[PDB]
Amino acid sequence: MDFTMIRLVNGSGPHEGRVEVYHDRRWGTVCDDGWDKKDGDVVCRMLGFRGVEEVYRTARFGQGTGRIWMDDVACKGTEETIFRCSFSKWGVTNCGHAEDASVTCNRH
């Protein structure tokens, strides 16, 4: 069910974009602090892709709005859901939306 609470927005296709997660009845973004291919691989597999192609820092697919829900995401890279990775307290970040994280998943 966790796959319903993550999404990729404003990419060239559904395989890529700004990462947004659903928490407390709202979509919010993910800070790029410590954002790396281990975290991206977890996101990509959650969404049904084979894995991560590349991750991007500094709002590569534009700034989100609203809450920044996750910061300092520290996935090992093999988790079945990003919500079992280590990360910040929900909504507690030292980030702005200029730091919103993104991913391109291996698909094409």
Say whether residue 81 binds ligand NAG (CB under 6 A): no
- Residue of 61, 67, 82, 95 interacting with ligand NAG (CB under 6 A): 61
Instruction: Name which of 43 and 85 has its Cβ closer to ligand NAG.
Output: 43
- Residue of 17, 29, 30, 33 interacting with Ca ion (CB under 5 A): 33
Rounded distance between C-alpha atoms, residue 76 and residue 93, angstroms: 20
Rounded distance between C-alpha atoms, residue 78 and residue 42, angstroms: 7
Residue 84, classed as helix, strand or coil, is helix
Say whether residue 56 binds ligand NAG (CB under 6 A): no
* DSSP output for 38-54: HHHHHHHHHTT-SEEEE
Binding residues (CB under 6 A) for ligand NAG: these are: 10, 61-62
